[PDB]
Amino acid sequence: MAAEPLTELEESIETVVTTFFTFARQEGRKDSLSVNEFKELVTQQLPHLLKDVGSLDEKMKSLDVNQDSELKFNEYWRLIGELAKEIRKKKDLKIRKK
Amino acid sequence: MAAEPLTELEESIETVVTTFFTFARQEGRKDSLSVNEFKELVTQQLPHLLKDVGSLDEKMKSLDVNQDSELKFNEYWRLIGELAKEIRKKKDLKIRKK
User: For every residue of chain B, which 3-state class applies, written as one string?
Assistant: CCCCCCCHHHHHHHHHHHHCCCCCCCCCCCCCCEHHHHHHHHHHHCCCCCCCCCHHHHHHHHHHHHCCCECCHHHHHHHHHHHHHHCCCCCCCCCCCC
Q: Which residues of B touch A47 (CB under 8 A)?
A: 5
d(CA A93, CA B39): 28
Q: Other C-beta atoms within 10 Å of B94: how many?
A: 16
Nearest CB to B47 within list A5, A72, A77: A5
Listed in sequence order, the residues at least 6 apart from A91 whose beta carbon sits closer than 8 Å to its beta carbon are none
- Taking alpha carbons only, the member of A62, A57, A55 closest to residue A86 is A55
Distance set, CA A30 to CA A54, A66, A72 (Å): 30, 19, 8
CB A42 within 8 A of CB B7: no
Phi, psi (deg, nearest 5) at residue A6: -100, 90
Total beta-carbon pairs less than 8 A apart between chain A and chain B:
125
> Are B83 and A10 within 8 A, CB to CB?
no
- Taking alpha carbons only, the member of B23, B15, B1, B27 closest to residue B77 is B15
CB B94 within 8 A of CB A15: no
Nearest Cα residue in chain B from A91: B18
For residue B82, the one-letter residue type is E
Q: Is B74 annotated as a binding residue?
A: no
Q: Is A71 exposed, middle or buried (0-12, 13-18, 19+ CB in 10 A)?
A: buried
Which domains, and CATH codes, for chain B?
1-98 (1.10.238.10)
Q: Collapsing DSSP states into helix, strand and coil, what is residue A70?
A: strand
Q: Collapsing DSSP states into helix, strand and coil, what is residue A22?
A: coil
Distance set, CA B66 to CA A78, A82, A95, B34, B72 (Å): 21, 22, 38, 10, 14
Q: Other C-beta atoms within 10 Å of B64: how many?
A: 10
- Taking alpha carbons only, the member of A9, A74, A30, A69 closest to residue B54 is A74
Q: Is B64 annotated as a binding residue?
A: yes
Q: Is B52 annotated as a binding residue?
A: no
